[PDB]
C-alpha cells in the first residue's frame, strides 16, 4: 500500500521517499519498478 | 523470526506440545537431587539428557 512523499514542503528529505505498508512478515528486499522511467526503488530487509 | 513462525498442534516444535512439557519437566526435575546422588536424574537415566 504505497504513498510517495516529496522532499521539502516543511520536511526536508533527500529527494523523497516511497512509503509503503506491507503485510508480509518475512524479511525481504522490496522492489518498486517504474517501467516508464526504467528506474527501480528498493528497500533491503524491509520492516514489518 | 520466532513470532513469524506459527505451528499446527501435533508438531513436536509447538510450545504446547508434549515435548515442551517434557522439556520443562526435565529442566526442573533434574535439580531435585544432588549431582553426586544415586537418586540423581541424569545418573538414573543418562539417555534422557
Residues of B in contact with A27 (CB under 8 A): 1
**How far, in Å, are A28, A45, B9 from residue A42 at the CA level?**
10, 10, 38
What kind of experiment solved this structure? cryo-EM
Q: What is the resolution of this structure in A?
A: 3.7
B5–chain A Cβ distance below 8 A for any pair: no
CB atoms within 10 A of CB B3: 7
Question: How many Å lie between the alpha carbon of B1 and the closest alpha carbon of chain A?
Answer: 8
Question: How many Å lie between the alpha carbon of A25 and the closest alpha carbon of chain B?
Answer: 6
Alpha helices (H) along chain A: none
B46–chain A Cβ distance below 8 A for any pair: no
Q: Which residues contact B33 (CB under 8 A, 6 or more apart)?
A: B39, B40, B41
Amino acid at each position: 500500500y504505497p504513498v510517495y512523499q516529496y522532499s521539502g514542503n516543511t520536511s526536508g528529505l533527500n529527494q523523497g521517499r516511497l512509503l509503503f505498508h506491507r503485510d508480509t512478515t518475512y524479511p525481504s528486499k522490496v522492489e518498486a519498478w517504474i517501467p516508464g522511467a526504467k528506474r527501480s526503488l528498493t528497500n533491503q530487509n524491509a520492516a514489518i | 523470526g520466532r513470532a513469524s513462525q506459527y505451528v499446527a498442534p501435533g508438531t513436536v516444535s509447538s510450545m504446547f506440545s508434549p515435548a515442551a512439557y517434557l522439556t520443562e519437566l526435565y529442566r526442573e526435575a533434574r535439580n531435585l537431587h544432588a549431582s553426586d546422588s544415586v537418586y540423581y536424574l541424569d545418573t538414573r537415566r543418562p539417555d534422557l539428557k
